Design a protein around this motif. Structure first.
Motif, mmCIF file in Angstrom:
data_model
loop_
_atom_site.group_PDB
_atom_site.id
_atom_site.type_symbol
_atom_site.label_atom_id
_atom_site.label_comp_id
_atom_site.label_asym_id
_atom_site.label_seq_id
_atom_site.Cartn_x
_atom_site.Cartn_y
_atom_site.Cartn_z
ATOM 1 N N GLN A 100 1.182 1.773 -3.296
ATOM 2 C CA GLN A 100 -0.082 2.234 -3.851
ATOM 3 C C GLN A 100 -0.479 3.607 -3.332
ATOM 4 O O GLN A 100 -1.262 4.298 -3.991
ATOM 5 C CB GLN A 100 -1.183 1.216 -3.576
ATOM 6 C CG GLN A 100 -0.998 -0.090 -4.322
ATOM 7 C CD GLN A 100 -1.054 0.077 -5.823
ATOM 8 O OE1 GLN A 100 -1.825 0.879 -6.342
ATOM 9 N NE2 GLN A 100 -0.232 -0.684 -6.532
ATOM 10 N N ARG A 101 0.051 4.026 -2.183
ATOM 11 C CA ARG A 101 -0.133 5.400 -1.743
ATOM 12 C C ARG A 101 0.851 6.350 -2.396
ATOM 13 O O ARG A 101 0.746 7.562 -2.188
ATOM 14 C CB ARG A 101 -0.006 5.507 -0.226
ATOM 15 C CG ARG A 101 -1.218 4.988 0.511
ATOM 16 C CD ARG A 101 -1.123 5.252 1.997
ATOM 17 N NE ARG A 101 0.249 5.170 2.487
ATOM 18 C CZ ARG A 101 0.843 4.043 2.860
ATOM 19 N NH1 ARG A 101 0.194 2.892 2.793
ATOM 20 N NH2 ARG A 101 2.092 4.071 3.293
ATOM 21 N N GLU B 293 0.821 -1.197 0.000
ATOM 22 C CA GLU B 293 0.000 0.000 0.000
ATOM 23 C C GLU B 293 0.857 1.250 0.000
ATOM 24 O O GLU B 293 0.433 2.285 -0.520
ATOM 25 C CB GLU B 293 -0.921 -0.008 1.211
ATOM 26 C CG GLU B 293 -1.754 -1.265 1.327
ATOM 27 C CD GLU B 293 -1.154 -2.265 2.285
ATOM 28 O OE1 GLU B 293 -0.172 -1.911 2.972
ATOM 29 O OE2 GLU B 293 -1.661 -3.403 2.349
ATOM 30 N N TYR C 295 -0.596 6.714 -6.718
ATOM 31 C CA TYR C 295 -1.715 7.624 -6.886
ATOM 32 C C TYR C 295 -1.408 8.992 -6.304
ATOM 33 O O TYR C 295 -1.705 10.012 -6.935
ATOM 34 C CB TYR C 295 -2.965 7.039 -6.232
ATOM 35 C CG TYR C 295 -3.821 6.198 -7.151
ATOM 36 C CD1 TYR C 295 -3.247 5.258 -7.997
ATOM 37 C CD2 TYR C 295 -5.206 6.337 -7.163
ATOM 38 C CE1 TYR C 295 -4.025 4.485 -8.835
ATOM 39 C CE2 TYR C 295 -5.993 5.568 -7.998
ATOM 40 C CZ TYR C 295 -5.395 4.642 -8.832
ATOM 41 O OH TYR C 295 -6.172 3.872 -9.666
ATOM 42 N N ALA C 296 -0.818 9.030 -5.116
ATOM 43 C CA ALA C 296 -0.410 10.283 -4.500
ATOM 44 C C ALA C 296 1.104 10.413 -4.556
ATOM 45 O O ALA C 296 1.736 10.929 -3.636
ATOM 46 C CB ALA C 296 -0.902 10.361 -3.064
#
Lengths: 290, 158, 104, 217, 75, 121
Positions: free
Chosen positions: D212-213, D209, D216-217
RNA sequence: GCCAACGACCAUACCACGCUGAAUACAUCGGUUCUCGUCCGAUCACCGAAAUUAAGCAGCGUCGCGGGCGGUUAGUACUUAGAUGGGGGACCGCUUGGGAACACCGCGUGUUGUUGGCCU
RNA sequence: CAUCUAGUAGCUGGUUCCUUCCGAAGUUUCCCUCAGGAUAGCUGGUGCAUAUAAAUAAUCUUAUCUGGUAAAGCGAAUGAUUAGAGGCCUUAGGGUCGAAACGAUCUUAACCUAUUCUCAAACUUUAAAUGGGUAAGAACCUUAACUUUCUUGAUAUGAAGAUCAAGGUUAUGAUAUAAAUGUCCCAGUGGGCCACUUUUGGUAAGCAGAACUGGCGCUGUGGGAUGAACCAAA
RNA sequence: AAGUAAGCGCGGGUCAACGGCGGGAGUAACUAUGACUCUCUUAAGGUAGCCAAAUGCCUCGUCAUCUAAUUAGUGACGCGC
RNA sequence: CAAAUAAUAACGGAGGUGUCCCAAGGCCAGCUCAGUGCGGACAGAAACCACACAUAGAGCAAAAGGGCAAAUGCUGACUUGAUCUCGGUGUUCAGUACACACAGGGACAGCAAAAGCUCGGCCUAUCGAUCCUUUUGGUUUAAAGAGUUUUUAACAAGAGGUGUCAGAAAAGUUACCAUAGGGAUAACUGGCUUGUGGCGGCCAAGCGUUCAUAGCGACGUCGCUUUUUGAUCCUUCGAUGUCGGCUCUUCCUAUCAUUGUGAAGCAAAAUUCACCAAGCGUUGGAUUGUUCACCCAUGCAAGGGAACGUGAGCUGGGUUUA
């Protein structure tokens, strides 16, 4: 600590990881000679607890020790002792219960009666003639600290009162002082019949009478008074000498599939679908960013 | 110019294996050794009493004696060029049971089980071992996805 | 300073049992005349041959093995046993102390 | 007395190290193994080019020292000052000794004529093997032609023969350029200085994550 | 002058001629250096075999007079 | 050391330990000397805490110049029931995460009992 | 499905956390007259009964660490035996058999023996 | 000068007929031993025990045990060693915008963590090939119940032994130059040397030292013009 | 077991008996040099002389002389293996 | 080293031994070590107290290696099994000895409640024949005519010692020399070898006002050359005359000069670089036995070596017998 002493990590066995076995004594208790080829040695195993005294006779075999006789303290209600299951006194019953439990099934109760004349002296059974001696045990204490008067030595005199030939010295019997020895059977006789538990509850109505509701509760419930214990344990030393029948129960047959609770652990198809939605709904939660 | 003396070169002979250090498992003293039993010698470095000297590690003898802690094993050493049969008093931790003959003895157990029910048929009892005979004539069917599937010899270029 | 006690509890083979013994030393008790191999030595060198016999220079050892006599207290019976080679040796004399202050 | 490796050409023996068992080994006057813009990222320098041994030679320290400077001075002259990272991949931990015979004054007779032979460590050398690289320079693809000439100029100062391989990798990472470009195109190549980080499915999940964080960010 | 010591050259040619020699297989290997209390009246476990079939299959019913020792041997 | 003058086995200190409801004499008797409000660390991560006072005659002790004054060392080890799980010789074990009490629950125990303040220094 | 004493093999059993737990148990727990031991009833020894989400073997959870097994690396590396094979050498090709290892990916995460009990 | 005196010599030299058969050794230990013995091995002679299987013994297959060398390894330990990258930090070597600032960039070097280049006669989780050992049946396999003081058990059931019972087809392959066993401790020998492969010292050597098997010594003949050893073949 | 002879040991003499006969620093106006000082020691520290000698390794010493040219000769010099 | 059983060499490599120990031996019980983190007046980089982590990263007289965690480590408890005996086995090996280890039997004892098996040191080293001397020992055997006591002897077990450690009692010199041999062994020639010197070829940092190569040429690199010079020990020790010079002949080319040329940072002169090239030439002296180098001088110009060339060719200065 980080992946690299884990690679070089050698565990201890299983029981030394969990406190149960010495393995420096287990090596030396279960030693048989090699020109005594497959003869068993049958040590005597009394393990205490908080509210149980497990006395056993086991012999060393490879795929496990085999337990040939097992008398517990949670059955002495059947012989007239309701409370105080882990006494020095209540061990000599389970000492004596495990000896008479095994000499009737070995047929060695006609010979080798024992010591019903319970005195606290040193008692070593001379062999009955027309043949060799009696059943030998050896006491296996674990790592109970073997200081003088422990309850673990309160099953060796119990079992040697049944007639078993366990090798002795009175150095650790309760009532044999250390300057010198100074044998004294009477403090051993007091402890055998539960006198100094009776004397404390005959010395506690003089100092703090409210503390009966403390220590020596449940004597107040079951009505055991202090002058009864020298004859509660005494009349138990023949009711144990008259019915040693192993306490075998027959549920017939409720051990397996009971009844509802197999407790399966996460078949790997579920774990790969557990981390199907754990991964998909995380980025949808990260689509709540935008 | 040495061998001389007694545990020399046995840096790897009486080493322990990796993570097989420490306390000896307890069945090592629970094994029974009767006189005339085939027995390998692989010495234990963590038992410094009754170790065999280094010539006999890896060898195989028969138990000729049992005493309270050890077995006399009678082992063959080639002292060149001739074979003396050496008698070596070796403690029990350094001594193993040979598996070599208890998969011969499971054939004496079958050269009498198969000759038992051969009182009805008769022959062949077939009680001898046969080496790997050449194979047979056999019909390899393809079908299987007909052939070529054709290798060509090619991997060099880098 | 190898330390040995003056008294030992060990087997005596006349009472056939462990008694208490008292430990001593041996040194040598020098040679008589006539010993046989001394009376014979003294007739070889009766005069005009001139040193009929070897003379042992080129000695090599520093130490000796100590012969501890062990006389029994009851039967008055002395055995002997050698200890190993060591440079200094004392009978009795101040059992070593366990864990005290290191005196400079 | 620094006699060259001209007559060393049967070399036989197991590598005596500079260890706790022949102590008296010297400080090396040949130390540096790498030079150029050694602080460049992975993305800066896509082309890798090796000089690869197709013999079984015994390349000297002074040969390897000389060949790095000739590979350096051509690249800081032609293709730019700091558009390269040279990695000299042969670290010479070897002991070649010498029986020195101090035969001054012509009369002493004591020390060694043919008895007896303890040595004295003078040499240091690298065994190469076939197909085994000797130096790799990392640079851009605009200076592909300038790269090969500096490795050619380094060839004539090594013994044996050597082959100049443009590698089809993407830098010093062990990736095909296509497999570098595909795997960097989603998340999986988390970069470092020389090298990238690889394809992680383990473990446990907290660094999934975190990717994945940060996609996107 | 110090010429050439130590070789195992020829030493297996020379030791394979009269051959490399297994000892020989005995039915009666010695009992010596063997456990002496195992042996010393197992000398008399042989010397107690005054007979072995005539007076001995008398014993199979002479102890079956007391029905054998079938139970009490089980400790 | 040669810098303080101590060697092997030179008997430098004297200590003892008081356990259970008799420490609560000597804790609070030496804590109002520290005027129960105590420093912040002064509080170990292992959950024990302690302090040190000089002037030993503030413990209800008369000054008594036959012995001299002294500076002492007060360490309060602290724990829940079940901390003898690793102390028995037979069938031992370890305590786990919760229970095992942090620094911030010894401070939580100190703002209530004796009502001290933690003195952020 | 489990609980205990004694075990065998000795990480598939360990380590880190997290969350459950019916019942027998096991505990923590209470006390110091006795036996016993400490600077100290914490530990040990002994008497024995007033509350539970810590031990404990676990029920487990973890795209866990380690460990374990398989696959793949790889017929690769090396190697037996052969040649009046190659090459200036270093060394390399082939013939004749034998045949690894790291890593890498995937899989599962104690198995059981005797003796006493419990039944969610 | 004569005798003792043919003094002694582990040293050099020589040692006298033919054919037939078998055929070495340069290694072991020990020795004031290193140009020499004695010793064991290798050799021969002479027998003897067994000729109008299931006795065994020696290279492969099978079963099992053993091994740390090649390779492998350093994102495993121990030793090295190269580079960056991310940072606990409060170690700072002081900083930098500021008297120090914590008001910010952190500057770098420590320390930590995920990586990285390259490696080890006296390192190793792993781990071959060629090797070392053992087994592959009447000397056997299952029984029955006897003996025992030593033997153990409380068992004159163990464990060894001594007997009767019952067991098709002797339990891989190939071979059998006849194999077994004594004696003369029997003679010579105890300088070796060459080669593939592996090796150590040495810059190297037709040099020094070892492991392995094959050779010359001790051996003609064919081939390499030539030649101890190579190729072929005795 | 005492007392015991020479010799030895202890004491003195003797070197035209056998033999031996030292270092290290610091200092005088440019430098250089060390008459001077300190100190370590020894039985005594090599004096008067002499010298690269038939005696000096370095070495074919350095300067002068002798020759067109001298590793030779001669005169000097001298911390003189 | 050593090439995966064991064996295995060199004046191969890295070290160790000749001791220490009444505990550092024996055994039971309790205990956990290196280090690390958070703490606690004086007290700091370290003093002590205390908690948590600690796979041994410590410690064990051990030189190195193996081994070891309710131990073989640390601390206490009593202790003497570091005892008496009798064989047998392992190692080394000839399958001899000592010695060291082991596994047993027979005692008698220690620790422990007991199982336990303690016959020195956790394991691999720490040591020694005959003769002699000398103790302990039987409560002994003999001295040969027989008793008695002393003496002596003998037998069992130790000690005294052989470090060249299977164990003579041992300083030089010979140039005045002798003998037996040795090419199993040096000194010179011949052979192989070349680390040392030099002579070549690649790459080109650079030098050369400018110019990388007219002429050079760093760091590397690949060869040739034994003659100096080592290394070597093959041939010669019933002997190959061992340095130089003189004499005299032939050969090489790695070319100093000259012939014929190419090139220059070649104007001429003078020189430098290179090519074909071994035909002719390459001298007189002072000092030294030299051999190279140096000096005077002539010279258009003053090259380098081969048969260790050359002692029944000489000389005899060097070296080298009395």
């Amino acid at each position: 600590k980080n992946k690299q002493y884990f690679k070089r990590y050698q565990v201890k066995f299983r029981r030394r990881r969990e406190g149960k076995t010495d393995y420096y004594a287990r090596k030396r208790l279960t030693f048989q000679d090699k020109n005594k080829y497959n003869t068993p040695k049958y040590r005597l195993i009394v393990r205490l607890s908080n509210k149980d005294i497990t006395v056993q006779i086991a012999y060393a075999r490879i795929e496990g020790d085999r337990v040939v006789c097992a008398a517990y303290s949670h059955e002495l209600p059947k012989y007239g002792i309701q409370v105080g299951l882990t006494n020095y006194a209540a061990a000599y019953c389970t000492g004596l219960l495990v000896a008479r439990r095994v000499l009737n099934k070995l047929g060695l109760d006609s010979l080798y009666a024992g010591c019903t004349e319970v005195t606290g002296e040193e008692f070593n059974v001379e062999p009955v003639d027309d043949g060799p001696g009696a059943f030998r045990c050896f006491l296996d204490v674990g790592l109970a600290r073997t200081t003088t008067g422990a309850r673990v030595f309160g099953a060796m005199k119990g079992a040697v009162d049944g007639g078993l030939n366990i090798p002795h010295s009175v150095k650790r019997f309760p009532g044999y002082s250390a300057e010198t020895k100074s044998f004294n059977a009477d403090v051993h006789r007091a402890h055998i019949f539960g006198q100094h538990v009776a004397d404390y509850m005959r010395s506690l109505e003089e100092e703090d009478e409210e503390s009966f509701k403390r220590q020596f509760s449940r004597y107040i419930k079951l009505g055991i008074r202090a002058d009864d214990l020298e004859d509660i344990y005494k009349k138990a030393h023949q009711a144990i000498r008259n019915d040693p029948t192993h306490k075998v129960t027959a549920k017939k047959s409720s051990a397996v599939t009971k009844k509802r609770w197999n407790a399966k652990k996460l078949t790997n198809e579920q774990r790969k679908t557990k981390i199907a939605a754990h991964k998909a709904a995380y980025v949808a939660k990260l689509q709540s960013e935008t | 110019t040495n061998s001389k003396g007694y545990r020399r070169g046995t840096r790897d002979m009486f080493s322990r294996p990796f993570r097989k250090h420490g306390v000896i498992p307890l069945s090592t003293y629970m094994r029974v050794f009767k006189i005339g039993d085939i027995v390998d010698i692989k010495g234990h470095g963590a038992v410094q009493k009754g170790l065999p000297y280094k010539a006999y590690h890896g060898k195989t003898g028969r138990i000729f004696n049992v005493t309270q802690h050890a077995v006399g094993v009678i082992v063959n050493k080639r002292v060149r060029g001739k074979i003396l049969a050496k008698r070596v008093n070796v403690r029990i931790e350094h001594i193993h049971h040979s598996k070599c003959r208890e998969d011969f003895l499971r054939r004496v157990k079958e050269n009498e089980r198969l000759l038992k029910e051969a009182k009805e048929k008769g022959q062949w009892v077939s009680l001898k071992r046969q080496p790997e005979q050449p194979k047979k004539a056999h019909f390899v069917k393809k079908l299987e996805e007909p052939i070529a599937l054709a290798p060509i010899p090619y991997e060099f270029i880098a | 300073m190898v330390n040995v006690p003056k008294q030992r509890r060990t087997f005596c083979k006349k009472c056939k049992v462990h008694k208490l013994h008292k430990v001593t030393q041996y040194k040598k008790s020098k040679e008589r005349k006539g010993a046989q191999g001394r009376r014979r030595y003294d007739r070889k060198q009766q005069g005009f041959g001139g040193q009929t016999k070897p003379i042992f220079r080129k000695k090599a050892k520093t130490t000796k093995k100590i012969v501890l006599r062990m006389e029994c207290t009851e039967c008055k019976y002395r055995k002997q046993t050698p200890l190993k080679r060591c440079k200094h040796f004392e009978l009795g004399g101040d059992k070593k102390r366990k864990g005290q202050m290191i005196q400079f | 007395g620094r006699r060259p490796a001209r007559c060393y050409r049967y070399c036989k023996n197991k590598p005596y190290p500079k260890s706790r068992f022949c102590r008296g080994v010297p400080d090396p006057k040949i130390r540096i193994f790498d030079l150029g813009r050694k602080k460049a990222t992975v993305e800066d320098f896509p082309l890798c080019v090796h000089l690869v041994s197709d013999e079984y030679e015994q390349l000297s320290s002074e040969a390897l020292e000389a060949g790095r400077i000739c590979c350096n001075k051509y690249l800081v002259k032609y293709c730019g000052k700091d558009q390269f990272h040279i990695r000299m991949r042969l670290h010479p931990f070897h002991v070649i000794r010498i029986n020195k015979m101090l035969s001054c004054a012509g009369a002493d007779r004591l020390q060694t004529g043919m008895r007896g032979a303890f040595g004295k460590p003078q040499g240091t050398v690298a065994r190469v093997r076939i197909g085994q690289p000797i130096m790799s320079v990392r640079s851009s693809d605009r200076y592909k032609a300038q790269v090969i000439e500096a490795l050619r100029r380094a060839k004539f100062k090594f013994p044996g023969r050597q082959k100049i391989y443009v590698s089809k990798k993407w830098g010093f990472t062990k990736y095909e350029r296509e497999r570098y470009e595909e795997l960097r195109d989603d998340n999986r190549l988390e970069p470092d200085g020389c090298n990238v980080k690889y394809r992680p499915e383990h473990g446990p999940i907290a660094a999934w994550e975190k990717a994945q964080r940060d996609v996107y960010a | 002058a110090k010429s050439k010591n130590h070789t195992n050259h020829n030493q297996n040619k020379k030791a394979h001629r009269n051959g490399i020699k297994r000892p020989l297989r005995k039915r009666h290997e010695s009992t010596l250096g063997m456990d002496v209390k195992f042996l010393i009246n197992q000398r008399y476990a042989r010397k107690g075999n005054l007979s072995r079939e005539e007076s001995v299959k008398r014993y199979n019913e002479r102890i079956a007079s007391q029905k054998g020792k079938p139970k009490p041997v089980t400790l | 050391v040669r810098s303080f003058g101590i060697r092997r086995n030179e008997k430098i200190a004297v200590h003892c330990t008081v356990r259970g409801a008799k420490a609560e004499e000597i804790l609070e008797r030496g804590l109002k000397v520290r005027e129960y409000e105590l420093r912040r660390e002064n509080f170990s991560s292992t959950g024990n805490f302690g302090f040190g006072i000089q002037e030993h005659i503030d413990l209800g002790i008369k000054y008594d110049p036959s012995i001299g004054i002294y500076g002492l060392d007060f360490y309060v080890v602290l724990g829940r029931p079940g901390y003898n799980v690793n102390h028995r010789k037979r069938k031992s074990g370890t305590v786990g995460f919760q229970h095992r009490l942090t620094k911030e629950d010894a401070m939580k125990w100190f703002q209530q009992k004796y009502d001290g303040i933690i003195l952020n220094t």
